[PDB]
Motif scaffolding. Structure first.
Motif, PDB file in Angstrom:
ATOM      1  N   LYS A 238       0.856  -1.181   0.000  1.00  0.00           N
ATOM      2  CA  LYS A 238       0.000   0.000   0.000  1.00  0.00           C
ATOM      3  C   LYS A 238       0.892   1.230   0.000  1.00  0.00           C
ATOM      4  CE  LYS A 238      -2.690   0.396   3.357  1.00  0.00           C
ATOM      5  NZ  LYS A 238      -3.853   0.732   4.274  1.00  0.00           N
ATOM      6  N   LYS A 239       0.504   2.203  -0.815  1.00  0.00           N
ATOM      7  CA  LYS A 239       1.189   3.485  -0.861  1.00  0.00           C
ATOM      8  C   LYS A 239       0.207   4.533  -0.405  1.00  0.00           C
ATOM      9  CE  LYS A 239       4.235   2.085  -4.330  1.00  0.00           C
ATOM     10  NZ  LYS A 239       4.661   2.435  -5.654  1.00  0.00           N
ATOM     11  N   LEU A 240       0.696   5.578   0.253  1.00  0.00           N
ATOM     12  CA  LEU A 240      -0.160   6.601   0.857  1.00  0.00           C
ATOM     13  C   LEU A 240       0.341   7.974   0.528  1.00  0.00           C
ATOM     14  CD1 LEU A 240      -0.100   4.976   4.358  1.00  0.00           C
ATOM     15  CD2 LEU A 240      -2.163   5.146   2.779  1.00  0.00           C
ATOM     16  N   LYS A 241      -0.563   8.946   0.638  1.00  0.00           N
ATOM     17  CA  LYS A 241      -0.164  10.341   0.847  1.00  0.00           C
ATOM     18  C   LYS A 241      -0.774  10.821   2.126  1.00  0.00           C
ATOM     19  CE  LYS A 241       0.024  11.818  -4.077  1.00  0.00           C
ATOM     20  NZ  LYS A 241       0.118  13.135  -4.812  1.00  0.00           N
TER      21      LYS A 241
ATOM     22  N   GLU B  76      -3.916  20.936   7.376  1.00  0.00           N
ATOM     23  CA  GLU B  76      -4.028  20.406   6.063  1.00  0.00           C
ATOM     24  C   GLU B  76      -2.576  20.274   5.510  1.00  0.00           C
ATOM     25  OE1 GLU B  76      -5.049  21.645   1.761  1.00  0.00           O
ATOM     26  OE2 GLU B  76      -6.185  22.886   3.253  1.00  0.00           O
ATOM     27  N   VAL B  77      -2.251  19.099   4.993  1.00  0.00           N
ATOM     28  CA  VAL B  77      -0.912  18.814   4.457  1.00  0.00           C
ATOM     29  C   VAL B  77      -0.991  18.868   2.924  1.00  0.00           C
ATOM     30  CG1 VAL B  77       1.001  17.068   4.352  1.00  0.00           C
ATOM     31  CG2 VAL B  77      -0.326  17.475   6.552  1.00  0.00           C
ATOM     32  N   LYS B  78      -0.081  19.617   2.306  1.00  0.00           N
ATOM     33  CA  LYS B  78      -0.145  19.798   0.832  1.00  0.00           C
ATOM     34  C   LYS B  78       1.060  19.182   0.212  1.00  0.00           C
ATOM     35  CE  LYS B  78      -2.719  24.192   1.528  1.00  0.00           C
ATOM     36  NZ  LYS B  78      -2.821  25.692   1.278  1.00  0.00           N
ATOM     37  N   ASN B  79       0.918  18.768  -1.037  1.00  0.00           N
ATOM     38  CA  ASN B  79       2.105  18.365  -1.823  1.00  0.00           C
ATOM     39  C   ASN B  79       2.819  17.169  -1.265  1.00  0.00           C
ATOM     40  OD1 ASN B  79       1.491  20.726  -3.296  1.00  0.00           O
ATOM     41  ND2 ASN B  79       2.816  21.954  -1.929  1.00  0.00           N
ATOM     42  N   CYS B  80       2.106  16.321  -0.528  1.00  0.00           N
ATOM     43  CA  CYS B  80       2.792  15.108  -0.072  1.00  0.00           C
ATOM     44  C   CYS B  80       3.129  14.221  -1.296  1.00  0.00           C
ATOM     45  CB  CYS B  80       1.968  14.393   1.001  1.00  0.00           C
ATOM     46  SG  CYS B  80       2.847  12.971   1.652  1.00  0.00           S
ATOM     47  N   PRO B  81       4.383  13.768  -1.430  1.00  0.00           N
ATOM     48  CA  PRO B  81       4.643  12.789  -2.513  1.00  0.00           C
ATOM     49  C   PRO B  81       4.026  11.423  -2.114  1.00  0.00           C
ATOM     50  CG  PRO B  81       6.675  13.147  -1.206  1.00  0.00           C
ATOM     51  CD  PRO B  81       5.579  14.075  -0.622  1.00  0.00           C
ATOM     52  N   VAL B  82       3.939  10.441  -3.032  1.00  0.00           N
ATOM     53  CA  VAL B  82       3.387   9.169  -2.654  1.00  0.00           C
ATOM     54  C   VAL B  82       4.443   8.556  -1.726  1.00  0.00           C
ATOM     55  CG1 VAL B  82       2.190   8.912  -5.115  1.00  0.00           C
ATOM     56  CG2 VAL B  82       3.990   7.262  -4.318  1.00  0.00           C
TER      57      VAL B  82
ATOM     58  N   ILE C  50       4.078  17.729  29.939  1.00  0.00           N
ATOM     59  CA  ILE C  50       4.048  18.433  28.670  1.00  0.00           C
ATOM     60  C   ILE C  50       2.995  17.761  27.817  1.00  0.00           C
ATOM     61  CG2 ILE C  50       5.359  18.732  26.585  1.00  0.00           C
ATOM     62  CD1 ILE C  50       7.833  19.124  28.462  1.00  0.00           C
ATOM     63  N   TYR C  51       3.179  16.461  27.628  1.00  0.00           N
ATOM     64  CA  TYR C  51       2.281  15.616  26.857  1.00  0.00           C
ATOM     65  C   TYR C  51       1.357  14.930  27.863  1.00  0.00           C
ATOM     66  CZ  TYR C  51       6.433  16.334  23.799  1.00  0.00           C
ATOM     67  OH  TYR C  51       7.512  16.905  23.119  1.00  0.00           O
ATOM     68  N   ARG C  52       0.110  15.332  27.888  1.00  0.00           N
ATOM     69  CA  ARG C  52      -0.820  14.867  28.867  1.00  0.00           C
ATOM     70  C   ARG C  52      -1.447  13.633  28.341  1.00  0.00           C
ATOM     71  NH1 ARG C  52      -4.531  18.783  28.223  1.00  0.00           N
ATOM     72  NH2 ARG C  52      -3.326  20.193  26.966  1.00  0.00           N
ATOM     73  N   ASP C  53      -2.265  13.010  29.148  1.00  0.00           N
ATOM     74  CA  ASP C  53      -2.706  11.684  28.849  1.00  0.00           C
ATOM     75  C   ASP C  53      -3.549  11.523  27.617  1.00  0.00           C
ATOM     76  OD1 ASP C  53      -4.827  11.261  31.741  1.00  0.00           O
ATOM     77  OD2 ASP C  53      -5.282  12.043  29.865  1.00  0.00           O
ATOM     78  N   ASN C  54      -4.124  12.594  27.134  1.00  0.00           N
ATOM     79  CA  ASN C  54      -4.944  12.577  25.963  1.00  0.00           C
ATOM     80  C   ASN C  54      -4.258  13.237  24.771  1.00  0.00           C
ATOM     81  OD1 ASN C  54      -5.154  14.843  27.658  1.00  0.00           O
ATOM     82  ND2 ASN C  54      -6.704  15.593  26.348  1.00  0.00           N
ATOM     83  N   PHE C  55      -2.979  13.504  24.896  1.00  0.00           N
ATOM     84  CA  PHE C  55      -2.110  13.868  23.775  1.00  0.00           C
ATOM     85  C   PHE C  55      -2.110  12.787  22.714  1.00  0.00           C
ATOM     86  CE2 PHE C  55       1.917  14.262  21.492  1.00  0.00           C
ATOM     87  CZ  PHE C  55       1.869  15.576  21.143  1.00  0.00           C
ATOM     88  N   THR C  56      -2.520  13.119  21.499  1.00  0.00           N
ATOM     89  CA  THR C  56      -2.448  12.160  20.395  1.00  0.00           C
ATOM     90  C   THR C  56      -1.971  12.813  19.084  1.00  0.00           C
ATOM     91  OG1 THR C  56      -4.797  12.480  19.829  1.00  0.00           O
ATOM     92  CG2 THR C  56      -4.350  10.658  21.356  1.00  0.00           C
ATOM     93  N   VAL C  57      -1.435  12.013  18.155  1.00  0.00           N
ATOM     94  CA  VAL C  57      -1.082  12.526  16.824  1.00  0.00           C
ATOM     95  C   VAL C  57      -1.793  11.663  15.811  1.00  0.00           C
ATOM     96  CG1 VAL C  57       0.658  12.925  15.092  1.00  0.00           C
ATOM     97  CG2 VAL C  57       1.124  13.468  17.411  1.00  0.00           C
ATOM     98  N   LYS C  58      -2.564  12.286  14.921  1.00  0.00           N
ATOM     99  CA  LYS C  58      -3.226  11.515  13.890  1.00  0.00           C
ATOM    100  C   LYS C  58      -2.767  12.006  12.546  1.00  0.00           C
ATOM    101  CE  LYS C  58      -7.584  12.178  13.333  1.00  0.00           C
ATOM    102  NZ  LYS C  58      -8.912  12.137  12.758  1.00  0.00           N
ATOM    103  N   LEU C  59      -2.325  11.088  11.689  1.00  0.00           N
ATOM    104  CA  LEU C  59      -2.165  11.400  10.276  1.00  0.00           C
ATOM    105  C   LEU C  59      -3.369  10.907   9.492  1.00  0.00           C
ATOM    106  CD1 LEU C  59       1.533  10.148   9.627  1.00  0.00           C
ATOM    107  CD2 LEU C  59       0.778  12.590  10.175  1.00  0.00           C
ATOM    108  N   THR C  60      -3.893  11.751   8.600  1.00  0.00           N
ATOM    109  CA  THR C  60      -4.951  11.361   7.674  1.00  0.00           C
ATOM    110  C   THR C  60      -4.346  11.131   6.299  1.00  0.00           C
ATOM    111  OG1 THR C  60      -6.500  12.722   8.860  1.00  0.00           O
ATOM    112  CG2 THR C  60      -7.266  11.998   6.722  1.00  0.00           C
ATOM    113  N   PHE C  61      -4.799  10.065   5.662  1.00  0.00           N
ATOM    114  CA  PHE C  61      -4.267   9.659   4.356  1.00  0.00           C
ATOM    115  C   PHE C  61      -5.290   9.737   3.245  1.00  0.00           C
ATOM    116  CE2 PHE C  61      -0.528   8.216   6.359  1.00  0.00           C
ATOM    117  CZ  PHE C  61      -0.817   7.352   7.409  1.00  0.00           C
ATOM    118  N   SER C  62      -4.817   9.669   2.015  1.00  0.00           N
ATOM    119  CA  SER C  62      -5.683   9.314   0.880  1.00  0.00           C
ATOM    120  C   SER C  62      -4.938   8.217   0.081  1.00  0.00           C
ATOM    121  CB  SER C  62      -5.941  10.551   0.027  1.00  0.00           C
ATOM    122  OG  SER C  62      -4.750  10.855  -0.691  1.00  0.00           O
TER     123      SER C  62
END
Length: 306
Positions: free
Chosen positions: A172-175, A231-237, A294-306
């Motif tokens: 699988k390839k993503l942006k 919003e992330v722009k110009n992501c290469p595959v 600094i990073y509290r218990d509900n600190f999260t990082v989400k990347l969204t893909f297409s």
């Protein structure tokens, strides 16, 4: 700490045939050299996991297999599987064959590989138990390795064996099109304006986003929800193992490992559906308890893909 028979080494039998150790340096190299010629003559294979340091492989009769791993980072999934293929052949062809694995402290990189090896050999059913086990012998899943990504890559090995027949999953390839960070207050300026995100693939920077200025992005800060969406722009595959690094211009966000505030690896073929969300314990650096104000218990990082 191994003591018997004249030797004094930072060296541990994880099992009777599996050894974790420190750097054979100039643990002095001639003594590590002597130990194997003495205790395992002609029956050893050494795995040097350092991307950064090598040594005289001839002190070990040239039976040294290299895996290039950055400190506080992970092998490529491919190298991880190659390692397991190589260790398996060597382990299964002579009952007396022994493998010894190291980089620097015989901690994080080293635990990523022996833990995987322990799964391949059937000692444990799950990554978590292999990890807790290497933890016992070399000081809890974070005793086993140093970083969340190191933990995920053992999880990746487990899932390869259980769900994909011991081979790599379909490609699988993503942006990346989006990034979302929760519990932003207290992290840097608390509104995302000090942050930028770097995407690394095969050791090359492949995209840089700078949030405040809209450099390959657009930042949106929502104080009601204590979060930022970008919003992330110009992501290469993207393909394979990807490392995502977050940097900050802010003076009060410390850098942990890898010279940045927080980072993480994932493999594009092992991503499920449209996104990957990481909890605090699953991100590299915030996973360390000294950063939990600094990073509290509900600190999260989400990347969204297409």
């Amino acid at each position: 700490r191994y003591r018997k028979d004249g030797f004094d080494l930072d060296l541990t039998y994880v099992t009777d045939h599996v050894i974790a150790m420190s750097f054979p340096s100039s643990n002095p190299i001639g003594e590590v050299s002597r130990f194997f010629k003495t205790k395992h003559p002609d029956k050893f294979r050494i795995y040097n996991l350092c991307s950064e340091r090598g040594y005289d492989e001839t002190k070990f009769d040239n039976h040294v297999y290299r895996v290039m791993i950055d400190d506080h980072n992970v092998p490529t999934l491919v190298d991880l599987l190659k390692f397991i293929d190589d260790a398996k052949v060597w382990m299964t062809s002579d009952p007396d064959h022994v493998i010894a694995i190291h980089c620097k402290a015989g901690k994080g990189r080293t635990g990523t590989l022996v833990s995987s090896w322990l799964l391949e050999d059937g000692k444990f059913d799950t990554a978590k138990e292999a990890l807790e086990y290497f933890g016992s012998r070399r000081t809890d899943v974070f005793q086993g390795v140093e970083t969340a990504s190191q933990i995920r890559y053992v999880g990746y090995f487990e899932k390869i064996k259980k769900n994909y027949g011991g081979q790599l999953p379909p490609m699988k390839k993503l942006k990346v099109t989006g990034v979302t960070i929760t519990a932003i207050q207290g992290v840097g300026r608390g509104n995302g304006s000090d942050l930028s995100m770097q995407i690394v693939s095969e050791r090359q920077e492949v995209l840089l986003c700078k949030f405040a200025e809209g450099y390959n992005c657009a930042l949106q800060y929502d104080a009601t929800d204590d979060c930022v969406t970008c919003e992330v722009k110009n992501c290469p595959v993207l393909a394979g193992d990807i490392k995502v690094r977050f940097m900050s211009t802010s003076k009060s966000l410390p850098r942990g490992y890898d010279n940045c505030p927080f980072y993480f690896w994932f493999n594009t073929s092992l991503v499920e559906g449209d996104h990957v969300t990481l909890k605090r314990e699953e991100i590299d650096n915030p996973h360390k308890k000294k950063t939990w104000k600094i990073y509290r218990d509900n600190f999260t990082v989400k990347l969204t893909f297409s």
